[PDB]
Structure formats: C-alpha cells, structure tokens
C-alpha cells in the first residue's frame, strides 16, 4: 500500500477505503490505491478526492475494476473474465448502504440479483431466465416473503387457509397489495380494498371492516383492528414481527 506520509486515506461506501497521493505523479495525476478482498487495485486521477477508476487482476486472471463516483457517493466493483469484457459479478454500493449485487452466467447475463435497501431489507432474485422471469424473495426484519418475478413486477405471496395475500412491487418501486379468498361461506369469506394513497389494505368479513394492514415506507407491516361493529379503528397499530402473525391476520 502507500505511506501515511505520502498519502491521504479516504473512506468510501461499503466500508471501503482508498489512498490518494499527496503529490501528483510524473504525469501530473494523483495515484490511487485500494485493497479489495486481498487484491490491491491501482489507478490515477486528475483529481485528489479519491474518485476515479482502480484496477487489478486476480490470480485466476479475472480483471477487477473499481469505479469511485465523483462525489464519493457510489462505488461500482466489477469482476470480468480474463477477456476484460464478460462480467462474472458486479456490485454497486451507495453511500446510504443500499446496493445492487448481480451474479452473471457463462455468457455474461445476470442470473441472480440482490437489491439491498438502506434500511437493510432485501429483494433477492435467482433463476433469472432470459425472458426476465425468475424466483423472488423479500428479506425483511423478522420474516421472509416469497414469490416470483416477471419483466413487469415482483409478487410476494402469503397463504393461510383459502386466503391468498399478494404484494406486488413494480420496477419503479410501486407497491400494491391484494387479497383473494376462495371461501364460499359469505359469512366467513375475506374481502379487501387497497388504498394506494395510504398504502393500506382494509379487510372485510360479513359486511364488517375487520383490520387495516399498513405497508410502511420503512418496509414493515402493521395491523390494527376495527371495533365490534366494524366502523372505526380501535387501539393502536401493532407492527408485524413474524410471518405467522401475517397468517394470523389472514385467518
């Protein structure tokens, strides 16, 4: 690496660091060094903030490239095959802890994708086929929701008895929730209405509103019951912590 006397250490997204030389090199560019996964990457830049491109080659000949954004707000770490073009892996990390980590296949096509939100919640995609479809999972605090993915959107599903709950997330991040019950008895059959404006799903049974399921901006779900006659909410909303609790809300 570089000498403390000869360089400034700068922190970066994803717990990374880069050493920027104090002086410009013989070409009038600052030197850049960063060790990533035991491999030292090198680059130079006309600027001295730590932004630029660094590169290195693994023992297996794979080319590694790290791009540090101009304001140090993002890093892109790519590992290519020895041809330096076919992607093997790619991870973009933001200063806010969010990131997108993509695994590619033998032909350089993303086969898997992991999207980490700043709050730590994840959206994991695998078995990604050529037509944009694949398997999906949403990793939340306390529980995991599972579903599928298609070019249009991701759909996580939760079933309990004859009731199926589906949470849709489009590419734009738009969320919508819906519920369907195959129950025949009109006295026990669940029905629901979605209010996008408030991100809440109101369940009804036997002509009475029973519960409001709120899907928060903080990627949590809360439940609150309506009074005995089903007209107004009672008490306070309680946050879901376990998958079983969602199912209990669907019973």
């Amino acid at each position: 690496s570089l000498d403390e006397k000869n360089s400034v250490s700068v922190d970066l997204p994803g717990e990374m660091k880069v050493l920027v030389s104090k002086e410009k090199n013989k070409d009038g560019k600052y030197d850049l060094i960063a060790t990533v996964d035991k491999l030292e990457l090198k680059g130079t830049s006309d600027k001295n903030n730590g932004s630029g491109v660094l590169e290195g080659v693994k023992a297996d000949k794979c080319k590694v490239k790290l791009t540090i954004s101009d304001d140090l707000g993002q890093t892109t770490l790519e590992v290519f095959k020895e041809d330096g073009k076919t992607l093997v892996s790619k991870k973009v990390t933001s200063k806010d802890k969010s990131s997108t980590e993509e695994k590619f296949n033998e032909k350089g096509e993303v086969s898997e994708k992991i999207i980490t939100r700043a709050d730590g919640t994840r959206l994991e995609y695998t078995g990604i086929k050529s037509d944009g479809s694949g398997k999906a999972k949403e990793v939340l605090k306390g529980y995991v929701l599972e579903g599928t993915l298609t070019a249009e959107k991701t759909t996580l599903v939760v079933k309990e008895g004859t009731v199926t709950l589906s949470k849709n997330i489009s590419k734009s991040g738009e969320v919508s929730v819906e519920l369907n019950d195959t129950d025949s008895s009109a006295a026990t059959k669940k029905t629901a209405a979605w209010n996008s404006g408030t991100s809440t799903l109101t369940i009804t049974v036997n002509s009475k509103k029973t519960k409001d399921l709120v899907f928060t901006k903080e990627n949590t779900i809360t439940v609150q019951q309506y009074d005995s006659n089903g007209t107004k909410l009672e008490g306070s909303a309680v946050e879901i912590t376990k998958l079983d609790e969602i199912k209990n809300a669907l019973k």
Partner: antibody
Amino acid sequence: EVQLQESGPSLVKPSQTLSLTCSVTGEPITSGFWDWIRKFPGNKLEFMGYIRYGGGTYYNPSLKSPISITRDTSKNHYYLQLNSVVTEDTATYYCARSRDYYGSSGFAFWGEGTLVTVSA
Amino acid sequence: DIQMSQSSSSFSVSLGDRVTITCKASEDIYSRLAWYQQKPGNAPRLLISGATSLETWVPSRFSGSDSGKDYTLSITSLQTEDVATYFCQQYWSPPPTFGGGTKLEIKR
C-alpha cells in the same frame, strides 16, 4: 437536487441564545456533511461546524463562543445554537452541504443566508 | 488553524484582459484547496476543488494553478459576468479556513 434555506430572527440581544434552522429539500440529511458558515460584516468567512452520519458533529475550536448542532431527520432539518451571543456574532449565517459524501471537501450547495444582528 | 492569505482585497481589470488571483496557506496544504465566486446578494459558489479541478458549471476561461510558489485562480479573458469576489479555502486540516477574498471591478 438539494435546496437549503436558513431561518431565524434578524435581531438577538447580547447574552441571549441564537437559534437558526436549515430546512433541506431534495435530499435527506442522513448522508453527507451539513455545515454552518457565517459571513462577518467585513466580508470575512468562517466555518462554524457540521453534523453528519448518525448525528455525529464537529465544531470549529477557534470560535469565540461555543455552539451546538442537532438535527431532525424526520423533518429533514438541522439546527444551529449559540448561547450567550456577543455583538461580534453579528453576521450572515449560511447552511451548506459539503461537496463529497466522505473525506474533506469544499461546500458545494449553499442556502441564501440570513442576516442576524446581535445588538441591545 | 492554517491562515489563508489573499493579499489583494480588490483589483480593476479591463474587459477581455487576463486576471490572476493569488492565495497563500500558512503551511503546506497539498492542493486540498477550494475556490468560490461570490456575487452581491448571492451565496458563494464552489468554482474549483483540489486547487485545479474546475466544477462543471465553470466556463473554460477559468483555471487554477499548483505549479507556482502559492496558489492562483486565473481568467484568460475577463467577461462582465465575472465581476465578483473570489475566496480560496483550505480543507487539508481542521478547521477549514478561508482567504480574505479578492474583489474584481471591470473598467469601462
């Protein structure tokens, strides 16, 4: 893109406390450095302090009077407080975001600034 | 505190003429210097970072130099829109400190 706007009284008496607010829009204050800089009547600039990730702060040790910086991530507002001001605290106060998200850099985005006079 | 010194408080320049503004640090700051342009009734605007790296809004006539005894901000051809006060500032070591400002007046 971020927008910064300072708010506070134009007149505060010596011995009293000066409180200012910086209302930021277009970006959350949860990332980056959010500073307070003042411009003295003789056209002299002075860095006062900043608040950053997790509410961590730093204050210019050379300041005549001690200050404190806090934030409300819910409101996306951060504040400046200076107790027992003196006439020498008369200046135009500016809030600004540092250029880069890590390390030491300049002040890229500034508010319009508010003139605060400290006088009896 | 590192003292940043701009020995000239103000200059008067002719339209289209070359201008050079000087900035000195009390100690070595290794080009971790910023420059700002401030026009009356407006907040300072970051113009240069790293002593020579221009920001994207800046016209090509502006430049900064490292290769001298101290630091400078140069304008090859002064335009009417350049009449302003320029401030240098170091961010090498805390706390960041500013130069006193150099005001420009255009002749007519």
